Structure 1
Amino acid sequence: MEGLNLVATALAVGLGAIGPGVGIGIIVSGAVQAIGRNPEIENRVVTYMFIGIAFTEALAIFGLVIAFLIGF
C-alpha cells in the first residue's frame, strides 16, 4: 500500500502512550496517597515519583522518536 507508513506512524504514537499514561497515573496516585498518609516523606516520595515518571516518559519517547523518523 501507499499510506501504510501513515498507519505505522499512528500505531507507534497510539500504542506508545497506552502504557506510560496508566503508569504515570498510578505513580502519581500512589505518591499523593502516601503523602496524604505521611507528609514528612514528601521529598523522597516526590523524588521516587519523578524517577518512575521519567522511566515511562523515556519509554513513550521510544515510540515518539520512531514515529518522528517515519514522519520525517
Structure 2
Amino acid sequence: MAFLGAAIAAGLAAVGGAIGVAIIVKATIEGTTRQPELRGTLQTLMFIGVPLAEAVPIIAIVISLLILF
C-alpha cells in the first residue's frame, strides 16, 4: 500500500501537471497564431501559468517522495 501510494501520488499527479502545462502552452500558441505582435506579453503570461499549473503536482511528488522514503 505504501509502495502503491508513492506510485499513485506521483502517477495521477503526472497527468495533472502534464496536461496542465500542455493546456497553457496550446493557448500561448493560439495566442501567437492570432497575433504575432504579442510574442513577449504572452510569453511572460505563459511563464506565469506554467509554475502554478505545475505547482500542485510537484507537491504531490513531495508527498510521493515522503511515502517513498
TM (norm. structure 1) is 0.86
Misfit runs of 4+, over 3 Å = none
Count of residue correspondences: 69
Percent of residue pairs identical: 38
1:37 aligned partner, one-letter code: R
Q: Point out where structure 1 has 5 or more consecutive residues left out of the alignment.
A: none
Please state if 1:27 is matched with 2:24. yes
Alignment RMSD (CA, Å): 1.0
Larger CA Rg, structure 1 vs 2: 1
Letter of the 2:16 partner, please give it: G
TM-superposition CA deviations, 1:36-68 (whole Å, max 9, x none) = 211111111011111111102111111110011
Q: How does 1:9-48 map to 2 (within 5 A)?
A: 9-48=6-45
